[PDB]
Amino acid sequence: EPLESQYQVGPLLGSGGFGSVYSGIRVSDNLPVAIKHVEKDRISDWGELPNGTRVPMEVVLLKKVSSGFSGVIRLLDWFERPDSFVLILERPEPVQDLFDFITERGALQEELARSFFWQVLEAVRHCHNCGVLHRDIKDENILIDLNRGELKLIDFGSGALLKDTVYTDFDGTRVYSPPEWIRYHRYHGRSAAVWSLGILLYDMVCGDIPFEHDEEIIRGQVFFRQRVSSECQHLIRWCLALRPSDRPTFEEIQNHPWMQDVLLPQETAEIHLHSLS
Numbered sequence: 001e002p003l004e005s006q007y008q009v010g011p012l013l014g015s016g017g018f019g020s021v022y023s024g025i026r027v028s029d030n031l032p033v034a035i036k037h038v039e040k041d042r043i044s045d046w047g048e049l050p051n052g053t054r055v056p057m058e059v060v061l062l063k064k065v066s067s068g069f070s071g072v073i074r075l076l077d078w079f080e081r082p083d084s085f086v087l088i089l090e091r092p093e094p095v096q097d098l099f100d101f102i103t104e105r106g107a108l109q110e111e112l113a114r115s116f117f118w119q120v121l122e123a124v125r126h127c128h129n130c131g132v133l134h135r136d137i138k139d140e141n142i143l144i145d146l147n148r149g150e151l152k153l154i155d156f157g158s159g160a161l162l163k164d165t166v167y168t169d170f171d172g173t174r175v176y177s178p179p180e181w182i183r184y185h186r187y188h189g190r191s192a193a194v195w196s197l198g199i200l201l202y203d204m205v206c207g208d209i210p211f212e213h214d215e216e217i218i219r220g221q222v223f224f225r226q227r228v229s230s231e232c233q234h235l236i237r238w239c240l241a242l243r244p245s246d247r248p249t250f251e252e253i254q255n256h257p258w259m260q261d262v263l264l265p266q267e268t269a270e271i272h273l274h275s276l277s
């Protein structure tokens with residue numbers, strides 16, 4: 001029953017606004033896991049969860065998207081403590097987040113960016129279909145299962161239930177938030193999500209984020225610092241359309257020509273990941 005008699009804690013993987021996550025192993029089968037600690041004082045949103053009670057919104061969101069689909073991390077279990085909650089999440093091995101992967105390898109070839117991007121679209125779409133809005137889509141929040149070549153969306157600590165009405169609260173990453181939020185402190189789930197997908201695609205093909213200051217976000221002028229195909233630039237600028245309604249739907253993004261003939265996960269890994277893995 002105790003958390004200690006359950007898992008064997010390992011080294012700290014990282015910490016921040018989300019909390020502190022450690023590498024871990026489940027004593028029983030040595031199944032690799034991650035142990036995330038979050039203080040109750042940090043937690044702002046709470047949920048009830050089916051036939052349950054007091055629980056952080058993060059847990060509610062995680063369980064809602066839980067399933068066989070490997071595009072989003074799986075909550076394996078959780079525990080409540082006097083001042084914190086502990087989340088036991090799955091952990092692919094080897095693994096590396098998109099931020100480190102790009103920091104190390106730099107701007108990705110378009111074929112690779114296509115595969116990776118396509119996989120987050122499927123993951124985000126999955127969340128939406130399950131009534132969950134992530135709100136913090138970014139390189140750091142996407143894990144790369146190097147052997148399988150499959151990406152995983154993580155950290156639902158900024159998410160919320162998907163809704164068709166306005167959002168007047170945001171606590172994700174500033175440099176990924178849309179111009180509606182910066183200017184009017186209001187946005188709609190899917191539109192905002194598409195904007196951050198635009199920032200992410202740009203990050204993938206250019207090695208860095210397109211905007212830094214609020215003034216750049218509001219103006220939305222995209223400058224390509226690396227050689228990027230015309231199709232890709234078009235998609236990117238379409239997602240980064242100043243007016244929300246001018247942004248493509250997920251269907252339009254995935255039907256976009258630059259998005260065609262995506263590589264399969266294993267293919268991707270064999271051609272791009274095993275080369276160094």
Ligand SMILES: CN1CCCN(c2cncc(-c3cccc(/C=C/C(=O)O)c3)n2)CC1
Binds near residue numbers: 096
């Ligand atoms: C966002 N991350 C910032 C960068 C360092 N960091 C890392 C690094 N490598 C693997 C994982 C890792 C492995 C398995 C599950 C998870 C899940 C995290 C979550 O759902 O919050 C994370 N997390 C902690 C959080």
Ligand SMILES: [Mg+2]
Binds near residue numbers: 058062154155157
């Ligand atoms: Mg999470």
